[PDB]
Amino acid sequence: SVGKPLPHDSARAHVTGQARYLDDLPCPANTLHLAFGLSTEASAAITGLDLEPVRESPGVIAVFTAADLPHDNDASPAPSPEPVLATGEVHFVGQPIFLVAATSHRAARIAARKARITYAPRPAILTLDQALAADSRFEGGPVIWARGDVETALAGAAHLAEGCFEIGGQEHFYLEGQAALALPAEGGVVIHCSSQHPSEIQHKVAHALGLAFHDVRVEMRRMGGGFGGKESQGNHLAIACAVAARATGRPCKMRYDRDDDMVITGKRHDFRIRYRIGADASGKLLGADFVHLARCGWSADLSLPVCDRAMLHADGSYFVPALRIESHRLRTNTQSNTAFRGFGGPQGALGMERAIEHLARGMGRDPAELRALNFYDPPEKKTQTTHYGQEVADCVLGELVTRLQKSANFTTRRAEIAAWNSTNRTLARGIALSPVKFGISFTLTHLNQAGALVQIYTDGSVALNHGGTEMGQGLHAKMVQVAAAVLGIDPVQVRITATDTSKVPNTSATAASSGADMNGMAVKDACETLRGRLAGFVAAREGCAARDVIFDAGQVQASGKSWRFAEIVAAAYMARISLSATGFYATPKLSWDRLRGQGRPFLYFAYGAAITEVVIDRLTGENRILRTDILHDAGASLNPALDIGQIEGAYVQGAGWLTTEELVWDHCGRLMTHAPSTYKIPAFSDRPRIFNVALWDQPNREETIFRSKAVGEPPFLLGISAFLALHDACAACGPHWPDLQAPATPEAVLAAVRRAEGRA
Amino acid sequence: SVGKPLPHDSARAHVTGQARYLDDLPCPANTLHLAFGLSTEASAAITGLDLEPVRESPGVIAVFTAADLPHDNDASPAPSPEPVLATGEVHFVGQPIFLVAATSHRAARIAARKARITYAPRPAILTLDQALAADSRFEGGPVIWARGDVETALAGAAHLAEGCFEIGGQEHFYLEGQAALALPAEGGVVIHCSSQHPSEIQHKVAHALGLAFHDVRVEMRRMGGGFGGKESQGNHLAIACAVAARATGRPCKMRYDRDDDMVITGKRHDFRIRYRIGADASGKLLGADFVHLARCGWSADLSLPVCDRAMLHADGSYFVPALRIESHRLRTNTQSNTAFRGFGGPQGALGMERAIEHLARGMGRDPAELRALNFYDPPEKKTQTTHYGQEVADCVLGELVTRLQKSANFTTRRAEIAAWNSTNRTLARGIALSPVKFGISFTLTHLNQAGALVQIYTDGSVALNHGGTEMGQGLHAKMVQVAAAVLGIDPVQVRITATDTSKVPNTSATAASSGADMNGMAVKDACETLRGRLAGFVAAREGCAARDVIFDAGQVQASGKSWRFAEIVAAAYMARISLSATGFYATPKLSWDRLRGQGRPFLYFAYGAAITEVVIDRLTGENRILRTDILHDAGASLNPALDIGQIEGAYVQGAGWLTTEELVWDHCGRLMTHAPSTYKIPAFSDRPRIFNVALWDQPNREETIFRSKAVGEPPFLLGISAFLALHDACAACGPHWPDLQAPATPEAVLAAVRRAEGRA
């Protein structure tokens, strides 16, 4: 079943509005609703906290403060704490300071605004330089990795390019907002939330309430979008909900209004990247030296892994004999940044990407050959390594880009464009090609495990359950498909159930594009046990050997006789053979050392390429993507439709990141862009007018679920091509380095134009 | 932990009203409430059905009729159907005809009464003779089993007794009544209910909705008692709930008001038992021939297995060279009878016990030696068999009864009584010893399976889950105990979860006193798995063998180091070892054939004995139990507290059965006793004033979880001593056979008195 383009498991339900998300679930009439009241300072001591106006507000029932917290007060996904309710001082504008449970969402919102709070302000750190200045950082100092000796390499280099440039963050904007609900259930709680990580929600709620893990059960059936935004900031909602619940005696739900959501949660780490890169006379890179300043926010969240991944991707798609990264994870008084599709990767990649382009302009070379010339070697003595020392044995980049350029009519188009430009004085088109190599697996190694539990009922139908969470990316269907493929029956007999830490325990968050790779195995593992039992039984019964019992298309065949799967199961039931099983999986071959920067942190890499073409307006910088062509490698895809879709969506999101998406804070730290009316994701019409997406269809070298390949994050990096192209257009307008910053808003583009035009 | 007298798992919650049973669960404001409208005819064709008044009644939302059922209309636990709504005709007073769904339980009841129905009455069959007469029956004819040649045997017997007697049914009176709730959950349903058989609730709900099983989940956390009454009559409530909820789009609950419950559900099968038994001059049984007429009601329900079980126990505790049974299972237009603690066994045993008393009286012998003399032989060439040919290899009655007689001062007490009676002309005391042997395992062999799913979280706590359902009998403690023992940690670390068919599938109803025998094994089975993975891991890590890793008391020990179980678990999680496992178990050695009456239908036999002392008043029949002494064999008890408890309570209920519980139908077939005000269970004061219960402590010969023994049903048979003792007091008043019938209400006793007295 694996391999066919079947629709998402809740397609119909989405499309008629029966699919329920969290705020849709029915709940008792006495359910309360909650809202945080937030700090209005970027950095201060809290000096007075009068809440009387709060308690007195209509419909309100309980109000909460760090002191009311019965046990832990900490939602951080990492060993250093992050209070859920402020403990004496605040650190960014948005930080929740107390919590309100009233008889209605509005009510709670309204009350949250009546507090009388006095602060003793303090100097605030809002910018990388400020941070740098004040040595405000995480991990007691920057992280440095080095392979070879760069300064040597670069001092003696025929060509060179130094450059510095800004990469702005990005707000997830998941259509369904953060949200959760908790229901006291004799002794313990049951939380429903919209999170990518129920096993953690469990852990944090448990600690928040002083309960052993077994007294807390998180169920989560679907999220309306997550993109990393829900890898951890689901914690504050769950904690508050469980805590209000334990106190008031009653169910408590909490959902952030959009404005709150954007102000409180984190975003993608914005980066400043400073690079020197250099090459040979023939164009082979000689070395690249990089410094990453990354804006993490006021607490650790997942900065640690994120910045590790960006370093880990600083080689972009190329082999480089010497390469250095110095990675500062700067602490600042603003939203605590966190995961976002790509998890650092795009930042590191775009780093190398910008440079190599700068390099190419420098030597009047065509960027594309320059790249193509430095891709890692194809597979099949001594294989090349990355700067962290992992052999790259499966890079099909050379082949693929070639194939893409042909199919995209790359060369010819390039000319048509030059011409067209030369005849225009107000508009310029530009086009670029960018590649992608992304590694698969958590860099924090022991997260790479998954479990599934499978049940077959006497009427032959099946209930599948696994650790992943469906956030729109088709995970469940793939897992259904794998299961139906391994048991030999039609998918229709397989039903998916909601994710539930009481059914599969100790899960990792659904992330690192590892949802399907791993859960897939786990389910397969369960289904294999089950199938095993069936064959054993059939065999003894029909005298003969298990391995000749065949399950296919809903039918079982043995010794010339054949029966319907149901008929087999019923009979195993009568025979008393267990029809239930768990299954589990752990990614092999991984080992690496973060501090040393050496090892094999990944199983295999994902690749792909994209050629985008755009036009810009020389007067105002207005601009847009006319056409894009992608060719991306999803292994032996488990579901081509489902994959094409992630590819298309990711691309858009990726581009979105480098074009109109822009975060802005005011001089006092306030988030100015905190609502769709001022934070602008790709709207329907920004879709490329011609959008060709196709897949490289080749098995994965490594032994993954049906030789497929993760496909959720990788494709997000194809967005770079858009930025690259945007920059090709500026370059066409003058002979200077456009030095286009990201995000490329029109103001930004217009600025690049002028530089290149030499008008300042 | 196994072996300690620990409290029930939910004792704190029982005692402060926090434990929630089904009607306590909170549910959405829009939930609807249901009630059936019932037939008022014992047997007729439904000719007209005006429901208009119903739809018109206040708060009503939907009304249903067989025609409205969307798919199956059948709630029977057996191959022949039993409609949930009546189809054209009715067969007893109480049979549900249509179904109302209103915005409140009262509203529903009230509307249920407004229908205008016209019937076309038919002759009804209400008594055994009638049915016998009309050849009204199930299984197309009686069932006969014969071992040896009885006629021959009897004909040539030094001693003989023929007698015939009635045994009455019994209403469960579970303190929480039948009840269920169904929640549409996108495409499928979730049922909560109060039932001993969630996997079946699943089956029937599914079939009624037209859904594969996998779209139906039943969760059942605890029942307020079941005693058999919830082995199958949970079905109608669940089907109706689900059906109403498919149609109205909203959650529907249904619980039966007492009066309804007693009129609609079934009761223990009342019996008429005819016998001839005969012996040697020395007292050894020669043969015994038995006829069982059994009133099953309008529909199959579980008559089939029940009646098999009575045949199965017609040998009571005695070896009998020849013995025959003809068992009629007669259909009648009354409540469809069903399971009840003992499931036929008591009726069968009572049968033999009456007869051997009759024989004893006939030969001027003391019943007690008569019995003592014919018990099966102890264990340790050719071992005796039962009349179904199953060797009885573990009968310790001899040893046990002896011990009981002595500890209870039997003989001296017998004398004290004779004297006392001789000085008394209005009161008479009676005393009697009665033994029990009870087979353990469903007689419908493939039912004897169970499964469990266990989880260990990274803080070391543990979530246990198995297929059995808690109904007051202590199953979840015993299961927690086994788990804690096998894993080597303190029980506090293990929490039980609600029975849930999406977690352990395809379960048998919890019954046959086999809840723990089996789930215990399965739970051991998963724990052993998990403890296996842990040892493996410690082994590898500390180099050494797994069999030397030791879990005890919450601590793990190997090569001279030790750590806390939780430290092991966390370490395993980081090593990426699955901490989840299912478990399964199927009882071995069983094989037997219903039709022939031959086989091993049981793993082992439960035994015990009870001596009861009573007084009756020769004027009105009033009477009461003064003192009871029991010695019962629970194997190596999994929890002596919990086991003494089942013995106590069961004794009471058993006596209850043969003394004040009495069912009564009027000429039209209407149940006259349908409420506690007229059906009378033992009340506090009818407890024996001196009530000594003690356990026989010997490991089971068979390999049962910790060598323990089922103790749910067997001990109910100890009630028979109460009846036998009431009969001894009658006997004490005259030289004639009292012919005491059951139930021995005071009317009944007085009647016996007079027979004995020759006063008619």
Ligand SMILES: Nc1nc2c(c(=O)[nH]1)N[C@H]1C(S)=C(S)[C@@H](COP(=O)(O)O)O[C@H]1N2
């Ligand atoms: N439609 C949709 N796709 C998505 C997301 C989402 O929230 N919605 N989250 C992304 C992120 S951050 C990851 S890490 C992958 C997860 O895919 P996977 O489960 O198979 O690993 O989904 C990507 N694709």
Ligand SMILES: Nc1nc2c(c(=O)[nH]1)N[C@H]1C(S)=C(S)[C@@H](COP(=O)(O)O)O[C@H]1N2
């Ligand atoms: N307190 C209590 N004890 C009880 C019952 C009950 O509803 N409540 N049901 C009886 C019946 S019919 C059976 S079959 C056993 C179940 O014992 P087991 O589950 O451990 O097999 O409960 C016996 N004892």
Ligand SMILES: O=c1nc2[nH][nH]cc-2c(=O)[nH]1
């Ligand atoms: O290496 C990681 N990659 C991720 N992608 N999305 C979430 C991720 C995470 O925790 N770690």
Ligand SMILES: O=c1nc2[nH][nH]cc-2c(=O)[nH]1
């Ligand atoms: O043999 C059985 N004995 C039972 N006791 N309680 C329920 C039973 C059943 O289904 N079968």
Ligand SMILES: [Ca+2]
């Ligand atoms: Ca966010």
Ligand SMILES: [Ca+2]
């Ligand atoms: Ca009943």
